[PDB]
Design a binder for this molecule. Structure first.
Ligand SMILES: NC(=O)c1ccc[n+]([C@@H]2O[C@H](COP(=O)([O-])OP(=O)(O)OC[C@H]3O[C@@H](n4cnc5c(N)ncnc54)[C@H](O)[C@@H]3O)[C@@H](O)[C@H]2O)c1
Lengths: 573, 469
DNA sequence: ACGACGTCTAAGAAACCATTAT
RNA sequence: AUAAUGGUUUCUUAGACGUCGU
C-alpha cells in the first residue's frame, strides 16, 4: 500500500541526487527508435502467423490462447517465441537481432540527453542497464566529446575496483537473461564475467539509492541479483524507487518485488511519473549549477521562423476571383494636439459624444485627429491646448499591423473618404461598417445595375422594401467594408449583405433574409459584387485606380489611391 | 498589382474498400464493393439491444425493421444513392434483440419526463443499464431512445444528458446509439438509413472505408479546448489530443489532465512548456505502443489557437532529434470568400462559372499563411447527371468559405499540409455527408474535450474511438 | 518594477433557431 | 442526440498600448 506520489518523488531527488544509482531498461530506449521486447514479440508472433495491418491483433492473440501458449505479458514469451521462429539458427538469430536493434533511427531524445548531461557533471555516478545498444554512449559522446567507460561481457574485470577507485561515471551493460541467446548456453566462462559484474552491483547498491525506469522484470538473473542486494544489511540507504508509466499495468512481478522490499524493511515505493522523457525533463527542471554549454545541448534551442517562399503568377484559366481590393497608399499626414494634462481614451470618447465634430479622432501616446482646427478647438477649449502639430505615419501597413488604434482610425478615414459625396448611407453594427442603400433614393440610374443583379430570369428586382410578415420593419441592400493587413499590404474586403432598419429588431426578419439569399449562386454573386464595386468606386471594372479624399477642404485631409480591380490568381502551368 | 501569385488544387482523395478497390464516393463505394473490414471478417455480426420505455419501445423496433430493407432518397438526390439493406452493403447480418435483451425503465422514465431532473436521471439510467453487467457477450451495440419529454432534463445551462451518459458508459465498454424524435422523421428515409447503418457498423468494430494513399511516413495530432463554465465566478478550460495514421484510423486517444488539478483552475487555453511536453510524450508513447514500437518520420500538429513560446519548444522536446515537426493553426473565420471564373472554351469567352470553386483549391497569401477551401464544387460524384458538379452546402450557403493555416513551424511546402488536411477531412464515420469543414483531428479533439469537461474527477486514462463517436 | 482599471482588434465556445444540395 | 452548418444572442480569451496609485 506504501506507494509514493508523483510530486513526492521530486523533492527527495532534488535534495539528495548524488547518492542515486539508475537501472535502465528497454523502455528508456523506446523513444530513441529502437523497439522494446514487446514490439519484437508482436513482430515475431505476427511473423509466425504469416506492412501487415495491426488491426487483427485480437484474432491472432485468441488463436495463440487456443493452442495454450504461456500467457500474454508473461515473462516467458521472449525466449519461447525466439526459439519457435528461429529454431536453432544462431546466425539468423544474430542477423535478426542486429537489424532491429541496429544504429538505424538511433536518434536521441530529451531524456537521453538529460541523462548524459547528468553523467557529465558529478551528479549521477553509476548507471546500470540491460540494453546492448549505444544510445547512452552516443549521447554522452555528443554532449561531452569524450568516451564513456563501458563495462560489459568483453573482458571488463574492473567494475568493482572502479567503484573503490571511484572511477565515475561507471556504465555497466549487463547480459541479463536473453541478449542473443540464453545465459545457459555460454560455455567459454562468460557466465563468470556476468557473475563478477553482478557482484559489483552489491557494493554499488550498499551506498547508493536505486531508481529503476523502463524495466519490466522479464529477466530472472536480474531479479535474483536485486533480491540478493536487498538481503544485504542497510541496502539502499536512500531507498528504492521503481518508476512506471501507469499503475494499472504495473507488472505483478514488480509489485511482488516492491512488497518484498517493504516487508524486509526498505524505503521502497512504486512511483508513477509517466514516460521516461517526461520524468527526465521534470528532474532536469530543478537542477542547480547548470553549465552554460550543457544547457544548449540538453534542451532544443530556438527554432528558426517559418518562411515558405511565395510562388509566381500562374497560367491555367479555371481562375479564382477574391473580394479584396488593394490599397496602394502607404503615407498619410494627420494632426497631433499636445495637451497640458494627459487624458484617457474613455474621456476622449465621452467628449466626442458630447458635441458632434466634423472630424475623426483617436488616442495613442499622443492624440491624433483628422479634420479642421476649429473642430478640435470646439472639442477642446483653448486653455488646455498648447500647440498643434503633425504626425507622420509612414508605411501604414506595418503601423496598422503593430498598433491596433491606428487600424480603426485608418479604416474610418478610408470609409469616410469612400462614402463622401454620394447618396449611399452609413451604418455601423458590432464595429463593422455598412453602405446601405437609401429607401427614399433607391430609384435612380446609379443603382440600376444592382437591380439587374438581384432579379430573376432577366426581370428587374427590388433593392429596398418592407419585410413581408412585419408592418413596421424595412429592408435594404447593403455591403460590409473592412480593412485587413496581410503580408505587408492593405486590402479592403467587401461583402454584400441585407440591412434591417431597426437594428435591435433583426431577429424578426431572419427567415426573410435567408429566403432572399438562397439562390445567389456563383454567377449572381459575381454580378452583385461587380455592381457594388461599380457603385462605390464610380468607375466600372477594369479601371486602374481612383483617388478618394477625406476632408478635402481641410488642413489635415486624407488622400488614398485604392485600386478597383479585385485580387485574382491563376493556376500553375 | 492585384495578382495573388498562383494557386494549386489538391485532387479529391480516393477511398479504399473491400479487395483494395478505390472510389471517391463513400456510399457508392460501399454499395458496389463493400466495407474494408469485409476482407478479413472483423465484425462477425451486429447484434442490438433496446433500452427505452415500452410505450416508446415499438417505434424503436420499427427503425430496426427499416435498417434491413431498401430505401430511396427523396432529397439531395444528386449525391445520395439507393440504400440496399444491411446484409447487402456491409455483407453482415443485422441481428435483432432477443427476449432477454429488451431492458426497460418504465417507472423511472415518465417521472423524470414530468420533472426537471439532471444528474439523478443520468445515474439512474446507467444503473438500469448495469443490470446486464455480466452477460455482456450477447450484443455489440445498444440502441437507447430518449423520449421528447426527457427534453427538459436534456440540458439546462451546463449539464448535458447525452454527454454524461456517454461518459458513464465508456468505462463499461459498450457502444451506444441514441435515437431521438428527429431520426424517426425528416421524410427522407435514405439519409437516416445511410447515417445510422455506417455508425452501427463502425461501433460494432468495423472499418467502413479507408484512405487509399496510405504509404507515407507521417502522423497527425490535434488539440482543442472547451469552456467548462462552473456555477461560480470562474471559467475552466479543458483540452485533449489524438493520433492518426496516413490511412486515417487512429483508434485511441490520451485523456490527460493538465498538471496538478488541485489549485490550478486554468483560465486560458494555452499549455505551458511542461504540460505540452507531457501531452505530446504520452501521445507518442501511445502511438508507439499501438504500432509495435515504430516511430514516425514526420509529425503534424493542428491547433485552433496559436502556438506560444512554451508550446513550440515543448513540442520540439517530445520527439527525436531527427523527426520533422510541422505545427499548424487552423482558423475557421476569414474575410475572403473567392469566386470561380471559367476560361475561354470553344467560341465562349471567359465568364463566371456556374458551380463554385473546387474543393481542394489552396491559395498562398504570406510566407507563412495560406487559404484552404475544403468546401466547394466536387466532380465525379453526381448520381443523376454524369458531368455536373456537386456542392454539398447548397441548402445553407450559396457559396463556400475557406479556412486559414498559419504554419508555425516546418520548412517544407504547402502541398503536403493541404493534402494531409484534405485527406483527413474525409474519414469521419459519424458524418454521412461527403466531407467536413475541418479535419478529423480538430473534430475529435473538440468532442473528446466536450465529453471530458463533464467529469468531477481527473480521469487520466486512454479511451477508445467508438465510445464517444 | 508592477497591480488596478479603462480602450482597441482578433478569434472562438455556448446555446437556440432554421432548412435539406442549380 | 442519424447527420451537415448557416444565422442570432451573449460570454470570454489573447495581444497591444494608456492613466493612476504602489
Ligand atoms: N534496446 C535494447 O537493448 C533491447 C531491445 C529489445 C529487447 N531487449 C531485451 O529485452 C529484454 C528485457 O528487457 P525489458 O524488461 O526492458 O523489456 P520490456 O519490453 O518488457 O520493457 C518495457 C517496460 O518499459 C515500459 N515503457 C515502455 N515505454 C516506455 C517509455 N516511453 N518510457 C518509460 N517506460 C516505458 C513498459 O511499460 C515496460 O514496463 C532485455 O534482456 C533485453 O536484452 C533489449
Amino acid at each position: 500500500m506504501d506507494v509514493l506520489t508523483d510530486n513526492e518523488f521530486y523533492q527527495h531527488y532534488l535534495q539528495n541526487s548524488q547518492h542515486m544509482m539508475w537501472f535502465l531498461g528497454a523502455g528508456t530506449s523506446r523513444s530513441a527508435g529502437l523497439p522494446t521486447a514487446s514490439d519484437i514479440i508482436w513482430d515475431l508472433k505476427h511473423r509466425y502467423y504469416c506492412i501487415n495491418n495491426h488491426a487483427i491483433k485480437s484474432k491472432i492473440q485468441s488463436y495463440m490462447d487456443s493452442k495454450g501458449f504461456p500467457l500474454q505479458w508473461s515473462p516467458e514469451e521472449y525466449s519461447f517465441y525466439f526459439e519457435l521462429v528461429f529454431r536453432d539458427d544462431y546466425e539468423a538469430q544474430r542477423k535478426y537481432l542486429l537489424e532491429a536493434l541496429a544504429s538505424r533511427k538511433v536518434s536521441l531524445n530529451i531524456g537521453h540527453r538529460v541523462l548524459a548531461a547528468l553523467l557529465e557533471m558529478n551528479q549521477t555516478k553509476v548507471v546500470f542497464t540491460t540494453n546492448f545498444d549505444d544510445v547512452i554512449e552516443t549521447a554522452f559522446s555528443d554532449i561531452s566529446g569524450k568516451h564513456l567507460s563501458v563495462y560489459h561481457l568483453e573482458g571488463s574485470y574492473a567494475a568493482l575496483s572502479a567503484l573503490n577507485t571511484e572511477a565515475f561515471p561507471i556504465y555497466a551493460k549487463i547480459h541479463g537473461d536473453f541478449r542473443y541467446q540464453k545465459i545457459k548456453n555460454l560455455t567459454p566462462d562468460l557466465q563468470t564475467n556476468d557473475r563478477e559484474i553482478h557482484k559489483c552491483f552489491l557494493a554499488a547498491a550498499i551506498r547508493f539509492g536505486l531508481v529503476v525506469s523502463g524495466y519490466s522484470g522479464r529477466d530472472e538473473n536480474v531479479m535474483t541479483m536485486l533480491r540478493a542486494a536487498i538481503d544485504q544489511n542497510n541496502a539502499f540507504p536512500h531507498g528504492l524507487y521503481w518508476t512506471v508509466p501507469s499503475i494499472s499495468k504495473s507488472e505483478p512481478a514488480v509489485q511482488d518485488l516492491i512488497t518484498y522490499a517493504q516487508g524486509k524493511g526498505v524505503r521502497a515505493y512504486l512511483v508513477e511519473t509517466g514516460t521516461f522523457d517526461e520524468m527526465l525533463s521534470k528532474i532536469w527542471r530543478q537542477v542547480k549549477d547548470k553549465p552554460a554549454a550543457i544547457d544548449a545541448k540538453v534542451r532544443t534551442a530556438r527554432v528558426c521562423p517559418v518562411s515558405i517562399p511565395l510562388p509566381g503568377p500562374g497560367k491555367s484559366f479555371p481562375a479564382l476571383r477574391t473580394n479584396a481590393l488593394p490599397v496602394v497608399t502607404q503615407s498619410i499626414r494627420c494632426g497631433v494636439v499636445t495637451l497640458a494634462s494627459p487624458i484617457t481614451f474613455s474621456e476622449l470618447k465621452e467628449r466626442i459624444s458630447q458635441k458632434s465634430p466634423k472630424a475623426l479622432l483617436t488616442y495613442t501616446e499622443k492624440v491624433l485627429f483628422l479634420g479642421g482646427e476649429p473642430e478640435i478647438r470646439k472639442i477642446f477649449s483653448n486653455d488646455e491646448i498648447n500647440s498643434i502639430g503633425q504626425y507622420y505615419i509612414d508605411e501604414i501597413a506595418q503601423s496598422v499591423a503593430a498598433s491596433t488604434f491606428l487600424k480603426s482610425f485608418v479604416e474610418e478615414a478610408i470609409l469616410t473618404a469612400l462614402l463622401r459625396e454620394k447618396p449611399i448611407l452609413h451604418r455601423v453594427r458590432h464595429r463593422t461598417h455598412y453602405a446601405v442603400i437609401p429607401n427614399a433614393s433607391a430609384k435612380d440610374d446609379r443603382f440600376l445595375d444592382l437591380r439587374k443583379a438581384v432579379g430573376f430570369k432577366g426581370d428587374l428586382g427590388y433593392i429596398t422594401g418592407n419585410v413581408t410578415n412585419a408592418k413596421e420593419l424595412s429592408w435594404a441592400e447593403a455591403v460590409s467594408i473592412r480593412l485587413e493587413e496581410r503580408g505587408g499590404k492593405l486590402w479592403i474586403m467587401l461583402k454584400p449583405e441585407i440591412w434591417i432598419k431597426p437594428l435591435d429588431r433583426r431577429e424578426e426578419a431572419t427567415d426573410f433574409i435567408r429566403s432572399r439569399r438562397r439562390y445567389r449562386f456563383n454567377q449572381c454573386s459575381y454580378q452583385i459584387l461587380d455592381a457594388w464595386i461599380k457603385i462605390l468606386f464610380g468607375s466600372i471594372g477594369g479601371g486602374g485606380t481612383v483617388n478618394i479624399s477625406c476632408f478635402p477642404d481641410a488642413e489635415f485631409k486624407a488622400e488614398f489611391e485604392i485600386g478597383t480591380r479585385t485580387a485574382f490568381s491563376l493556376g500553375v502551368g | 498589382l492585384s495578382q495573388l501569385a498562383a494557386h494549386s488544387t489538391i485532387p479529391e482523395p480516393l477511398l479504399l474498400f473491400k479487395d483494395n478497390r478505390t472510389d471517391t464516393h463513400p456510399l457508392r463505394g460501399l454499395s458496389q464493393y463493400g466495407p474494408y473490414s469485409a476482407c478479413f471478417n472483423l465484425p462477425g455480426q451486429v447484434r442490438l439491444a433496446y433500452l427505452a420505455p415500452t410505450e416508446h419501445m415499438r417505434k424503436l423496433d420499427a427503425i430496426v425493421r427499416e435498417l434491413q430493407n431498401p430505401a430511396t432518397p427523396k432529397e439531395a438526390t444528386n449525391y445520395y444513392v439507393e440504400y440496399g439493406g444491411f446484409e447487402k452493403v456491409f455483407k453482415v447480418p443485422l441481428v435483432m434483440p432477443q427476449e432477454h435483451l429488451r431492458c426497460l425503465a418504465l417507472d423511472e422514465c415518465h417521472g423524470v419526463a414530468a420533472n426537471g431532473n439532471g444528474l439523478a436521471l443520468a445515474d439512474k439510467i446507467v444503473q438500469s443499464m448495469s443490470g446486464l453487467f455480466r452477460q455482456k457477450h450477447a450484443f455489440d451495440v445498444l440502441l437507447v431512445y430518449l423520449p421528447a419529454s426527457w427534453k427538459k432534463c436534456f440540458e439546462y445551462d451546463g449539464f448535458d444528458l447525452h454527454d454524461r451518459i456517454k461518459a458513464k458508459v465508456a468505462p463499461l465498454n459498450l457502444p451506444i446509439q441514441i435515437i431521438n424524435d428527429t431520426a424517426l422523421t425528416r421524410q427522407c428515409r435514405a439519409n437516416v438509413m445511410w447515417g445510422v447503418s455506417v455508425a452501427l457498423y463502425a461501433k460494432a468494430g468495423g472499418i467502413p472505408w479507408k484512405l487509399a494513399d496510405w504509404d507515407k511516413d507521417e502522423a497527425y495530432i490535434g488539440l482543442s479546448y472547451a469552456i467548462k463554465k462552473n456555477a461560480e465566478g470562474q471559467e475552466y478550460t479543458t483540452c485533449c489530443s489524438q493520433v492518426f495514421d496516413p490511412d486515417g484510423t487512429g483508434f485511441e486517444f490520451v485523456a490527460y489532465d493538465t498538471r496538478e488539478f488541485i489549485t490550478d483552475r486554468k483560465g486560458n487555453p494555452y499549455l505551458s512548456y511542461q504540460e505540452m511536453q507531457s501531452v505530446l510524450s504520452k501521445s507518442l508513447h501511445l502511438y508507439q505502443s499501438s504500432h509495435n514500437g515504430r516511430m514516425p518520420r514526420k509529425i503534424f500538429i493542428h491547433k485552433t489557437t496559436h502556438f506560444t513560446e512554451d508550446e513550440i519548444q515543448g513540442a520540439f522536446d517530445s520527439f527525436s532529434s531527427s523527426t520533422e515537426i510541422e505545427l499548424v493553426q487552423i482558423i475557421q473565420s476569414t474575410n475572403w470568400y473567392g469566386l470561380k471564373v471559367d476560361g475561354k472554351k470553344g467560341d465562349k469567352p471567359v465568364a463566371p462559372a456556374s458551380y463554385p470553386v473546387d474543393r481542394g483549391l489552396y491559395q498562398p497569401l504570406t510566407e507563412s499563411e495560406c487559404l484552404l477551401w475544403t468546401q466547394g464544387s466536387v466532380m465525379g460524384v453526381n448520381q443523376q447527371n454524369p458531368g455536373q458538379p456537386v456542392f454539398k452546402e447548397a441548402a445553407l450557403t450559396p457559396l463556400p468559405n475557406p479556412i486559414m493555416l498559419r504554419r508555425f513551424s516546418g520548412n517544407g511546402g504547402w502541398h503536403a499540409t493541404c493534402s494531409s488536411i484534405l485527406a483527413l477531412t474525409k474519414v469521419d464515420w459519424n458524418n454521412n455527408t461527403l466531407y467536413k469543414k475541418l479535419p478529423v483531428t480538430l473534430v475529435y479533439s473538440q468532442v473528446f474535450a466536450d465529453v471530458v469537461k463533464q467529469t468531477p474527477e481527473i480521469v487520466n486514462e486512454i479511451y477508445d474511438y467508438r465510445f464517444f463517436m
